[PDB]
Design a protein around this ligand. Structure first.
Ligand SMILES: C=C1CN2CCC[C@@]2(COc2nc(N3CCN(C(=O)/C=C/c4cccc5c4CNCC5)C[C@@H]3C)c3cc(Cl)c(-c4nc(N)cc(C)c4C(F)(F)F)c(F)c3n2)C1
Ligand SMILES: Nc1nc2c(ncn2[C@@H]2O[C@H](COP(=O)(O)OP(=O)(O)O)[C@@H](O)[C@H]2O)c(=O)[nH]1
Ligand SMILES: [Mg+2]
Length: 169
């Protein structure tokens, strides 16, 4: 069968989790999507010769730490940690997302990619070098994306898949 990869998209409200997910799956930019709608999306794609089923969870809605919520997030094999390059608070929030991911996975080594979204915008408050440097601090890859222009969208998800393979081996 297809090799399945459970990918989870996380990060602050309004960074573009939904727009990124919809661009990957449906190949168009949706600039407006209810921020409480959380759903799973699936795509058949070949990545480095391997036929893959991508199962992508677009997180949304309320922050909460029930056992049921942890159990759901725990099924993710790798995580896209998304901030917006024009929102410094979303960048500052990243450590919190990373802390929660390590917690539910019961491991200090979880496949993760730092994603700086909205790179089409002329004004930016988080420079590329600062974000590249934070990824190096964490030991994870960094990808700049725009759900609007498609820049880096495949790169970000496919890099996460490659990180999962490395962890499994
Ligand atoms: C420093 C902090 C701690 N908090 C204090 C406040 C800020 C912060 C949030 O923190 C914070 N938020 C989270 N939500 C809420 C905000 N949101 C949004 O999209 C909101 C959109 C929205 C909703 C309603 C109205 C509007 C909007 C946006 N438009 C305008 C109107 C992103 C995400 C769903 C959030 C979500 C999740 Cl799944 C998790 C998480 N949970 C677990 N149990 C286990 C694991 C492994 C994780 C994760 F790691 F895998 F993710 C978190 F941990 C989260 N954490 C950040
Ligand atoms: N310019 C630009 N705007 C974006 C991009 N991705 C999302 N947005 C906008 O950012 C806002 C929040 O996007 P959304 O996908 O709902 O973020 P979410 O809350 O993380 O799911 C909306 O106004 C989108 O139009 C992008 O790559 N570039
Ligand atoms: Mg959303």
């Amino acid at each position: 069968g297809s090799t399945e990869y459970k990918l989870v998209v996380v990060g602050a409200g309004d960074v573009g989790k939904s727009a990124l997910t919809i661009q990957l799956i449906q190949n168009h930019f949706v600039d407006e999507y209810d921020p409480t709608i959380e759903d799973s999306y699936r795509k058949q794609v070949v990545i480095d010769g391997e036929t893959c089923l991508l199962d992508i969870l677009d997180t949304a809605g309320q922050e909460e730490y029930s056992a049921m919520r942890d159990q759901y997030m725990r099924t993710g094999e790798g995580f896209l940690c998304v901030f917006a390059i024009n929102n410094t608070k979303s960048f500052e929030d990243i450590h919190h997302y990373r802390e929660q991911i390590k917690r539910v996975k019961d491991s200090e080594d979880v496949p993760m990619v730092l994603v700086g979204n909205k790179c089409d915008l002329p004004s930016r408050t988080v420079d590329t070098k600062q974000a590249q440097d934070l990824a190096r601090s964490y030991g994870i890859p960094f990808i700049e994306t725009s759900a609007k222009t498609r820049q880096g969208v495949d790169d970000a998800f496919y890099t996460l898949v490659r990180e999962i393979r490395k962890h499994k081996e």
